[PDB]
Amino acid sequence: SFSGYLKLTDNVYIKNADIVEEAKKVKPTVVVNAANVYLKHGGGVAGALNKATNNAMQVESDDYIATNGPLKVGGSCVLSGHNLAKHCLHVVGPNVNKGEDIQLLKSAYENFNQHEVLLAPLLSAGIFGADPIHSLRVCVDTVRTNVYLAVFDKNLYDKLVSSF
Numbered sequence: 001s002f003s004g005y006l007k008l009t010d011n012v013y014i015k016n017a018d019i020v021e022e023a024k025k026v027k028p029t030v031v032v033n034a035a036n037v038y039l040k041h042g043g044g045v046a047g048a049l050n051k052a053t054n055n056a057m058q059v060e061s062d063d064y065i066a067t068n069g070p071l072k073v074g075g076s077c078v079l080s081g082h083n084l085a086k087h088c089l090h091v092v093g094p095n096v097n098k099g100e101d102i103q104l105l106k107s108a109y110e111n112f113n114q115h116e117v118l119l120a121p122l123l124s125a126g127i128f129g130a131d132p133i134h135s136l137r138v139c140v141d142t143v144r145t146n147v148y149l150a151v152f153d154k155n156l157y158d159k160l161v162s163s164f
């Protein structure tokens with residue numbers, strides 16, 4: 001049920017789209033959130049996904065952290081997708097604005113391999129401060145399962161395609 005995507009490789013696809021609007025249209029098995037280790041969904045992809053769930057994602061997330069403690073940078077957890085998807089895979093890419101090791105970006109993308117198909121953003125890009133061209137290259141060289149990437153900014157989408 002994904003439509004309008006450009007094929008990059010055997011298993012990676014890309015579209016200029018808001019991931020929240022794509023999740024509402026497709027209702028995929030798995031939507032990836034660009035999480036932080038505290039699961040505090042304030043802005044960027046995480047803030048937008050949480051707003052679309054009417055804050056239910058944040059309430060579930062706070063219970064998960066109260067039980068388990070914070071995630072690791074490079075780690076993930078599977079929670080409910082609420083009204084957007086069956087599941088949300090909360091994945092923590094390194095935040096370069098906080099001095100986190102960019103080598104952890106490959107570890108972050110390895111979490112995608114546990115799921116046959118995912119709707120996802122570019123990890124560590126946007127407000128996380130990493131180069132999106134680098135994030136797309138790590139994605140293509142790490143993920144083996146079928147990934148549908150939604151890139152919100154049209155100018156960035158065009159650059160990602162034309163430099164691929």
Ligand SMILES: CC(C)[C@@H]1C(=O)NCCN1c1ncnc2[nH]ccc12
Pocket residue numbers: 017018019020044045046048121122125126127132150151152153156
């Ligand atoms: C992570 C970035 C590459 C990307 C981008 O193009 N500009 C910044 C935000 N972002 C998103 N990309 C997809 N869906 C989104 N919904 C909310 C934010 C967002």
